[PDB]
Amino acid sequence: EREAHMRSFNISRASVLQRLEQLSGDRKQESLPPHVRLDLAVRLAQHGLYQQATPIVDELHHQKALHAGHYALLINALACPRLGQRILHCDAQCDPALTYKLLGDE
């Protein structure tokens, strides 16, 4: 069951990184709508990939496309609630205090 949860998280993280590489390669000069970049930054930050999401947030804040709820959505996604599920089911052995203790390492 631990290997199954690890496999599921790695497949989802690979899909998110492939979506990011597709939106960065094919859309080199075509400017994306702001909500697609917002959803991509949220899905990047939720999977523990915070460095790949912060230039998107800098561009969205510089374009003044972000509003009151979108900032709270980005900060809540920065707590990584998809890496937390893998650390729950594999690393912390389902101890919910140990998820907070082990998410501070990443």
Partner: protein
Amino acid sequence: SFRYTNNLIGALKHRLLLESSYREIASRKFIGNCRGVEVVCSGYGTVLAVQLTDKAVWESFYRKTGSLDLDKLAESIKTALWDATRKIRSAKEAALHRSLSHNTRMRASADLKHWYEEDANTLRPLAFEALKHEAATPWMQLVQHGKKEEAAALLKEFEQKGNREQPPLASTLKAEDSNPATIPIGSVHPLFTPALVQIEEAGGGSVSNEAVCRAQLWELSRDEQLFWERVELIRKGQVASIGSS
């Protein structure tokens, strides 16, 4: 028993995750800003571009009438470069912690944290070996990353046929080069890479089962002759008969 083989598997899983993540960091952009100054670097720390986002609004801050600051601007380039270099070193620590988290749940890799003791100063990509890896030709980047079947085809088309916003290793290291299954046995460890290539195939990147079995079978013929020459030395056998004069 089998304490060496079970520890070698845990070390090579640590080396495969540290090789597949070095190819993820090096083919990536690291953008740091201070005050509208986009300093873009790659994973190797080389500055790709020193840009300015929205020149119309950031012109009045550096008073381009007036004279240029060259101290507000100089402290903005250095801060944006320092903020971009630490994101490289924070990504190498995320590469090391993910390499152990896939290993310490299987083979108790907390001791490999002690047996290696690596940090961002020692984890690859190193910024002072950035010249020979980034400024190399695309054929030389295919032979530095152990891709023989792709560098031989790029060499054949060299024979018969005849502010850059991208890191120079992004063309070589694609998304499929982040898999450890494609990583050969020669480049899994940059310390012993002059010696691990004899294990590897001549034309391919996989392990040559014929040459590996040949290196063992040459040792087995030498050690058997060392065995039976010592049985003759230690314990002599019974002597046959003659006729005394």
